[PDB]
Amino acid sequence: SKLIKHPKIRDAYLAQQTPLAWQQITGSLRTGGTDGVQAHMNRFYYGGVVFVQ
Amino acid sequence: SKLIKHPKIRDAYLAQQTPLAWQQITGSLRTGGTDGVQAHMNRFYYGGVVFVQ
Amino acid sequence: LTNSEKSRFFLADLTGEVQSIPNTYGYISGLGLFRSAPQTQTTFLMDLTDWDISLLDAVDRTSRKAETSAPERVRQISFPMMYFKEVESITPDEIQGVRQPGTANELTTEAVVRAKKLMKIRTKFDITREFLFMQALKGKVIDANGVLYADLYKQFDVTKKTIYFDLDNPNSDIDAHIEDLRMHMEDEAKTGTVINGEEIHIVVDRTFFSKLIKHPKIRDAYLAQQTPLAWQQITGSLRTGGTDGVQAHMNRFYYGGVVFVQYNGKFKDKRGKTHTLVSIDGVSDTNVGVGHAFPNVAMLGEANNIFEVAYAPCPKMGYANTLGQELYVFEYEKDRDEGIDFEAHSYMLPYCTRPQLLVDVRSDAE
Amino acid sequence: SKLIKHPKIRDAYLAQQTPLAWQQITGSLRTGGTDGVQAHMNRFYYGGVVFVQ
Amino acid sequence: ISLLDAVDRTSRKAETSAPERVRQISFPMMYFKEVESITPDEIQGVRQPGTA
Amino acid sequence: SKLIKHPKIRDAYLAQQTPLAWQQITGSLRTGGTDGVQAHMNRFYYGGVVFVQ
Amino acid sequence: IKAKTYPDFKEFVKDFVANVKAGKRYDFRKYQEAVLPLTYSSPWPESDIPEVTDFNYTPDYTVPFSEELLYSVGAQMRTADFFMDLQYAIINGKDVDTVYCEWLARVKPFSMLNAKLKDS
């Protein structure tokens, strides 16, 4: 939560007109299946690395 | 009414150039859905969820 | 695969062995800047000629009949070179009764000892070549023991230029510093030809690269841009390409016709002092970025390489007045069957003929 | 150098999106010309006129 | 590994290199044990939930 | 001069991604002419009309 | 500062420094996009900017560039950072004489806003 809403990433993506306009949509893009609880796990792409909740 | 004009959602949709953003910023929000009185039922997409009035 | 433990009468398990190998950097050596110039003598000479004087014709009166003239200058210089004598020997005492690491009851052999020893000698000999190439790029060829062998900005009567970027202050004009860096290498080449000035290499470290990409002007210039390059440099990896030998991809940045490349090479001497490749002598301060800029092969042409390395022979029979080689490896057997002796020689020295084209960039202000 | 970074010009060119004139902001200004010693001379386009250094 | 210092050509002097290091370690492991029992007292006269 | 520099007109034409807006804001405002002395007279497009100097 | 009470940026910043000189402080760098309208001729602010109480802002540079300039002419910085630096100049003793917004085109994340400062 503290990372996805940081001002350095937020404006960087509300300025990039690329299909990663999942800034308006959902982070639950994951291949969740933290099987057992939720179908899709939170996933954030930035700087070539991926943060998984 | 309070949700659709919230500054965060409205300014997130205004900054992106997608036909959906144009549809639910300047266009008609009626979209689809019958009511028995209304011919089209108010709808709004922000995240992975949809709001129906 | 099973051996003792803290008693000789019980058995434990030996899964295997884990090894750690020191990092080796080879970016500058792989750049191919320095071209080989094998020699047959221990020293060589050069001629330095400079007309360097055109001046403006002052007007005079037709009836007076008066006028001007112009002189000429020619000089000469010389060059010594460096020598290295890596030696090492093997004996039967390294095979008798010593078990191989990672195994239970298998004795080591002579072949593996010789192979690893020779490999260590070769890599130890290549890392010094890389260090000397970097030192020559810095403009001063200094031995790892701090012994000066070629002060190229005195042998050549020029002065090194340092460009202060001042990346801490947002009000600093990065475009002005880049333009100054580009213009100096055009106005100071004095090769008599036309200079592009934007083909230069730029090699920086962590501090300079981070402070450069952090700048508000640089970030703003790309944030409001819908080019895929802007998307990659603001959001994407920024580790585009390259290989310094330790990391799969070196990080590069584009802000026009120049490219900032972050190289972080470190070496140690016998005394344990770390010889970082991208550094400026004297300024042993953190939080200050240091970078080096130098021309590439395409700037001045291949009809004027500035960088080259001279190799000379070794003081052995049959190796007099012959072309030099990168490495001379000799093998000798001890008398009465007591082991094997090795040797490794190299008579080498890299140098740059226009050291004024080697400039430094700093993240601090003047 | 003073003309390049003037607010009336730099801001207008930064706001000007998809013009192929990102070169004047991000790219090199050495876009043509040559004196005796320099391969490409600085030049800038604004207001229908060209400023050459 | 270490860098090489330059040496005089006609003195014939040189630098050797030093040898490697070998060590050893060990590892213990955990043990997990769980027990269970079944008694007729859990079956006699007990209604299966969801049925009458 | 007063018309082309009005905050309404300039702010409206700045938030545009059309070639016309790019020409009017950062470009030659001298399309069309021969006023006798001028090779190209000033003209400005705002609505369905044009203003010629 | 209630939403859309000033019809343009020129009259918005004339009262923004008035409140700051009066002891009121603002900080909206985390929700900047939700309070800044688009185009400087739009009513300001887009949404009401709340007063902060914990205003502690120590910049990493000299906020007063010269004795009569907040930034060097042509310096680009985050729009929210402009207001934090403008407040810093007023706190330290510099009075605002004019805010440069006449020919600017962008208001959101990065803008070339500058101010002329004065003594006392």
Q: Is the CB of F17 inside 8 Å of chain D's CB atoms?
A: yes
User: Which residues of G fall within a CB distance of 8 Å from D7?
Assistant: 73-74, 100, 103-104, 112, 114
The β-bridge relationship of strands G77-78 and C44-49 is unpaired
Residue of D nearest to G112 (CA): D7
Nearest to C206 by CA among C253, C257, C153, C267: C253
Q: Cβ separation of F11 and G8 shorter than 8 Å?
A: no
Closest Cβ opposite residue C220 in set G60, G72, G76: G76
Query: What is the rounded CA–CA span in Å between residue E38 and residue E44?
Result: 12
Say what the resolution is, in angstroms.
3.1
Chains contacting D (3 or more CB pairs within 8 Å): C, F, G
Distance from CA of F19 to the nearest CA of G (A): 17
Distance between start and end Cα atoms, chain C? 64
Query: What is the rounded CA–CA span in Å between residue C334 and residue C316?
Result: 19
Give the length of chain A: 53
Distance from CA of D7 to the nearest CA of F (A): 13
Indicate the burial class of G44 (C-beta count within 10 angstroms; 0-12, 13-18, 19 or more).
Answer: buried
Query: What is the rounded CA–CA span in Å between residue G64 and residue G69?
Result: 6
Query: What is the rounded CA–CA span in Å between residue A18 and residue D9?
Result: 27
The residues, any chain, with a CB within 8 Å of residue G18's CB and separated by 6 or more, are none
Query: What is the rounded CA–CA span in Å between residue B11 and residue B2?
Result: 14
Interface of D with G in 2-21 (CB under 8 A): 2, 5-8, 10-12, 14-15
Q: In what order do the strands lie in the sheet with C162-164?
A: C162-164, C359-362, C290-294, C201-204, C259-262, C252-254
Angle subtended by helix axes C216-223 and C206-213, to nearest 10:
50
Q: Cβ separation of A26 and B13 shorter than 8 Å?
A: no
Indicate the burial class of G101 (C-beta count within 10 angstroms; 0-12, 13-18, 19 or more).
Answer: buried
The total of other beta-carbon atoms located within 10 Å of residue C17's CB is 11
User: Which residues of D fall within a CB distance of 8 Å from F30?
Assistant: 48
- Helix, strand, coil: what percent of chain B each, to 5? 25, 10, 65
Q: Cβ separation of G108 and B15 shorter than 8 Å?
A: yes
Number of H helices, E strands in chain C: 7, 19
The sign of the CA dihedral G102, G107, G112, G117 is positive
Closest Cβ opposite residue A15 in set C223, C238, C239: C223
- Answer for the pair E4, E14: CB distance below 8 angstroms, yes or no: no
Name the amino acid, one letter, at C164: Y
Closest Cβ opposite residue C124 in set E2, E14, E22: E2
Residue of D nearest to C175 (CA): D1
- Find the angle CA(C159)-CA(C160)-CA(C164) to the nearest 5 degrees: 130
Distance of CA D16 to the CA centre of its chain: 14
- Answer for the pair G40, G79: CB distance below 8 angstroms, yes or no: no
Q: Cβ separation of C235 and A15 shorter than 8 Å?
A: no
Instruction: Sort residue D11 into left (φ over 0), alpha (ψ -120 to 50) or beta.
Output: alpha
Q: What one-character DSSP code corresponds to residue C168? A: T
- Answer for the pair C11, C4: CB distance below 8 angstroms, yes or no: yes
Distance from CA of A21 to the nearest CA of C (A): 13
Distance from CA of G15 to the nearest CA of C (A): 27
Q: Cβ separation of A25 and B47 shorter than 8 Å?
A: yes
The token pair at G63 is: 């906020």
Query: What is the rounded CA–CA span in Å between residue G87 and residue G81?
Result: 10
User: Which residues of C fall within a CB distance of 8 Å from E22?
Assistant: 101
Name the amino acid, one letter, at G36: L
Whole-number Cα distances in Å, E46 to C329, E38, E39, E40, E51: 90, 14, 13, 10, 11
Whole-number Cα distances in Å, C233 to C200, F34, G68: 21, 48, 35
- Mutate which: F5, F9, F10, vs G, most G CBs within 10 A: F10
Closest Cβ opposite residue B12 in set A23, A26, A28: A23
Indicate the burial class of D35 (C-beta count within 10 angstroms; 0-12, 13-18, 19 or more).
Answer: exposed
Q: Cβ separation of A15 and C231 shorter than 8 Å?
A: no
Q: Do chains G and B touch (3 or more CB pairs under 8 A)?
A: yes
Q: Do chains D and F touch (3 or more CB pairs under 8 A)?
A: yes
The total of other beta-carbon atoms located within 10 Å of residue G111's CB is 24
Whole-number Cα distances in Å, G42 to C261, D42, G46, G80: 44, 38, 9, 17
Q: Do chains G and E touch (3 or more CB pairs under 8 A)?
A: no
The β-bridge relationship of strands C290-294 and C359-362 is antiparallel
Helix (H, G, I), strand (E, B), or coil: what is residue C350? strand
Q: Is the CB of C226 inside 8 Å of chain D's CB atoms?
A: yes
Residue G4 φ then ψ, to 5°: 55, 40
Query: What is the rounded CA–CA span in Å between residue G24 and residue G87?
Result: 10
Burial C89-126 (b: 16+ CB within 10 A, else e): ebeeeeeeeeeeeeeeeeebeeeeeeeebbebbeebbb
- Greatest CA separation for chain D: 36
User: Which residues of C fall within a CB distance of 8 Å from D26?
Assistant: 221-222, 225, 227, 230, 255-256
The β-bridge relationship of strands C259-262 and C201-204 is parallel
The sign of the CA dihedral A53, B3, B8, B9 is positive
User: Which residues of D fall within a CB distance of 8 Å from F14?
Assistant: 12, 15
Distance from CA of A28 to the nearest CA of B (A): 9
Residue of E nearest to C312 (CA): E9
Distance from CA of D28 to the nearest CA of G (A): 18
